Design a protein around this ligand. Sequence first.
Ligand code: LMN
Ligand code: PTY
Lengths: 85, 75
Amino acid sequence: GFIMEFAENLVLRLMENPEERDRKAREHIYEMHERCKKIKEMWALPIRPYGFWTFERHNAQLRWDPQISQVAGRRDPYDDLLEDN
Amino acid sequence: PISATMVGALLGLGTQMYSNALRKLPYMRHPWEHVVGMGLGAVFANQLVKWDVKLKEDLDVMLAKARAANERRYF
Ligand SMILES: CCCCCCCCCCC(CCCCCCCCCC)(CO[C@H]1O[C@@H](CO)[C@H](O[C@@H]2O[C@@H](CO)[C@H](O)[C@@H](O)[C@@H]2O)[C@@H](O)[C@@H]1O)CO[C@H]1O[C@@H](CO)[C@H](O[C@@H]2O[C@@H](CO)[C@H](O)[C@@H](O)[C@@H]2O)[C@@H](O)[C@H]1O
Ligand SMILES: CCCCCCCCCCCCCCCCCCCC(=O)O[C@H](COC(=O)CCCCCCCCCCCCCC)COP(=O)(O)OCCN
């Protein structure tokens, strides 16, 4: 053929779907705003959590001392006296 | 698209020639260590990507746990 009859549909192939572009734009806005709200919530967390000491890793002694309160140097004076019988 | 190896190998070759130039040497003085640097860069980039994925998922778990713990004050 001639030049323009091919350059026309060439440019038309080069250009994209606008419906896809609009859908992607509204989508991206939706999830970006949702993620923005999520990050805003995340930044509100205090440095020290409400539980803190309640956490099992932050006790480390309520389940260690009971198995140590029997060794010498930690016993209540009234433990060795009546342990004989 | 770049597959974390076309960038890791390029960075390895770049840092090999970069260290080679800082000693005032010809850029391709020792191509065997150039190949070694390419391989090392590719391996390091792949490891970095995998570690990033693992690290992100672990961070998501940590944030979920922290949010659940913080929510308990209201309820
Ligand atoms: C220092 C200068 C950096 C200049 C480069 C900038 C150019 C940007 C491209 C950087 C680049 C490599 C980084 C190279 C760093 C250089 C090395 C530094 C040391 C040199 C010695 C990361 O780029 C992508 O990496 C993705 C990793 O997940 C991340 O996506 C986010 O992740 C989630 C997180 O959990 C987020 O939640 C989520 O929102 C996103 O999905 C993003 O970081 C980004 O999309 C290129 O992508 C590469 O990574 C992956 C992605 O597919 C590919 O391999 C994958 O492996 C499996 C996963 O195990 C997959 O199963 C597999 O399918 C896949 O094959 C590679 O083939 C390649 O594509
Ligand atoms: C970060 C993203 C961007 C960077 C990407 C990096 C890419 C990955 C790295 C690629 C490196 C490629 C290098 C090519 C391989 C060269 C190997 C040559 C090794 C070698 O010849 O052995 C000795 C050289 O010393 C040595 O080479 C060993 C000393 C090397 C020092 C490394 C220190 C690592 C520990 C600290 C890491 C940094 C921590 C920072 C917090 C002998 O040398 P000779 O025979 O020439 O003569 C004696 C001179 N003494």
